[PDB]
């Protein structure tokens, strides 16, 4: 239950009017939690193979995601190759992938259940190993105020104004449509 503990002296500003400031405070005082049924593909992806775009099969990209529970391989649909390496990472990374995101998050390193070769080896392996199932639904809950939603409505990009703080006195029909949308979302 986030609060709004701010003295009324700083209501005056050179970027938000008194009405806009009061409306922002009132809409921030009332919050909404949102549950999104996002997905995952967890497990040690020991290899990341990216085959060429063959005509018969547009992507034969092998990648062997496997948790501690099971050993499994997968396939990339010519869209997720750069999702792994948006930042330059290697294989064996636990990937908290989301289907409607396109931004694959790598959690670092991971373990198999094999002893590898016969001579002395198995060196340099001490990290977190995948624990959960290969796939399971996650009803992730996110808490945001009306400020974020309104600044998203006003401009196509909203994180810049949320960080820097130059929202820009968003208009009323935005608040009306957000009222209707939140009412029907609660009803749904």
């Amino acid at each position: 239950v986030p609060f709004t503990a701010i003295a009324g002296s700083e209501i005056f500003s050179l970027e938000l009017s008194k009405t806009e400031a009061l409306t922002q405070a009132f809409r921030k005082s009332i919050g909404i939690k949102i549950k999104e049924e996002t997905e995952l593909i967890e497990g040690e992806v020991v290899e990341i193979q990216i085959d060429r775009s063959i005509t018969g099969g547009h992507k034969q990209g092998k990648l062997t995601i496997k948790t501690t529970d099971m050993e499994t391989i997968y396939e990339l649909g010519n869209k997720m190759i750069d999702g792994l390496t948006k930042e330059k990472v290697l294989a064996g990374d636990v990937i908290s992938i989301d289907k409607a995101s396109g931004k694959i998050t790598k959690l670092g390193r991971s373990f198999a259940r094999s002893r590898d070769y016969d001579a002395m080896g198995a060196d340099t392996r001490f990290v977190q190993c995948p624990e959960g199932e290969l796939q399971k639904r996650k009803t992730v809950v996110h808490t945001v105020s009306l400020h974020e939603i309104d600044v998203i409505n006003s401009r196509t990009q909203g994180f810049l104004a949320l960080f820097t703080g130059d929202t820009g006195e968003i208009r009323s029909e935005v608040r009306d449509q957000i009222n209707t949308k939140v009412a029907e979302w609660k009803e749904e």
Binding site: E47, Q49, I50, K88, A91, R109, A112
Partner: protein, 31 residues
């Protein structure tokens, strides 16, 4: 992405990224 991040023109092919922890020590198929 991280703008003007560290990169040494090592591969960076948008449709080629092969890595592993070396339990087999191989690479992607080609000819």
């Amino acid at each position: 992405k991280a703008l003007v991040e560290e990169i040494d023109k090592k591969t960076y092919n948008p449709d080629i990224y092969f890595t592993s922890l070396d339990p087999q020590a191989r690479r992607y198929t080609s000819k």
